Ligand binder design. Sequence first.
Ligand code: ZN
Lengths: 125, 262, 103, 37, 46
Amino acid sequence: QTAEVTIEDALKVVLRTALVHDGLARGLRESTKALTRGEALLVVLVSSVTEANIIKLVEGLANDPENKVPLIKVADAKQLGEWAGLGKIDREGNARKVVGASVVVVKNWGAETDELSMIMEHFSQ
Amino acid sequence: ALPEKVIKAYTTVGSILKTWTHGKLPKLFKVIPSLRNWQDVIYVTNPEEWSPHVVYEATKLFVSNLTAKESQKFINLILLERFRDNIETSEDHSLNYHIYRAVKKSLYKPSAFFKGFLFPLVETGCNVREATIAGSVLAKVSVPALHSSAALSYLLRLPFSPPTTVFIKILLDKKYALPYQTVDDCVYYFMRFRILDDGSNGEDATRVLPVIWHKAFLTFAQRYKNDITQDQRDFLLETVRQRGHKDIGPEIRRELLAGASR
Amino acid sequence: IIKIRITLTSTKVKQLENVSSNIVKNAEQHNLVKKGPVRLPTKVLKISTRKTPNGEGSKTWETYEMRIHKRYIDLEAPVQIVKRITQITIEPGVDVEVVVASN
Amino acid sequence: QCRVCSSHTGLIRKYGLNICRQCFREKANDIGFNKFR
Amino acid sequence: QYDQIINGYENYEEELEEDEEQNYQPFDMSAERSDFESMLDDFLDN
Ligand SMILES: [Zn+2]
């Protein structure tokens, strides 16, 4: 559906606070097998990934979702890797550069339980 | 009570595991991590007289195959107690190498290692040898930054002992990017040793601090000089001008004055 | 009505004699049937030790020694009297044992 | 083995005690073994 | 990111007591994995 800037930025805050709970599943085959086991309490998608066959496998399950398959779109892959803690770790004084990721699966919620609750109550409309 | 089939089978594999040195683990021993109730199963296997090889391999299986709370229950009920037993019943007060490899490998899951092993140890009789051994183990194993931050933050709120200062060494030499609240808690730990002239003092205000605390003050003031405020910098300068060291103290004040406020 | 055999083991003879005299003078003073303190022979426990911890000179020997004395007094008493004497009589150096059965 | 001084030599194995003799010769009086004769 | 992790560290005894009050169960044979008794029969037959 339509994604706002505030929802994507809040979800990136959720990813930056859910990496530190050791409850983020970052990797494409990890995302596929987290969707297979039912452990995927959220899968995050990037709409600016150049390859689209694996996206079309995901989008075949996005237009017809199951009861335990939540999905959400954001803007950039390198920004997703930044706020998943992989791509850039930019704090007030430090920097380190890795290539960012495409899909990140939230497994454990942690300190963003109410944040993810209102994000899931906002995506369902 | 447990069924007697489980009792005789795990008594049998307990009688097997007394002299294990090499090879593969038993099949009934490798399904206890897959069990919903582990704790009744491992008690029948007579936990105290394990071989060191099955201590290390049980550490490997029961860290790499569990959750965090499950592994902290495992390490606090099993590995911490056998660690204590294998130091205080050892004859030169040493540690076996397989037990050393077990305590090394159990920090691959750091939170379970901390809250099952380190934090009961410092409150239930942490002497010099236990903490020297555990500070060496914590010196070896590479940890993530936040678990080092939170375990250090527990070490700051502990009452003073030179073993706690040794643990503060080992977690302050990692040079990780701490949060600013962890640096604030380090400042608050470094407030309780200074002397307050307004009429509020304790044991730590006038006690003798060794060279180990001033090296810790040097380490914290050289790494985290840029993550403090100016009021905390002045309070640490008060701590310097009250209880500075002969050979470390001028270095600490000249590196504390070379820090920028946040 | 229960018959209790009390056996006392001690390495020191003075505290054992004081305990046995206190037991006899406490048992006779409130009208219980009993036997006297039956005196087992003193066990002498001997071990041999070298005079030479280091290998210099000829090999000669000494002996370390122990003395262990055993007494037992048979009593007939109710349960509360046996319990209060067992609570009272606990002293260092003398071991007190309470036997219920007579088989 | 001897749990006082890591002694792997001079053990006495009587009564499940496993002290070496060079540690038994000073701790005998605290155990109860006193020199009489 | 810090307040979630220091309450389980500074009050780890109280959180352990809360986790033991919330998540303690007795030993049930059927509530394990369904093939646990099969490996129990396989090991004792050597
Ligand atoms: Zn010795």
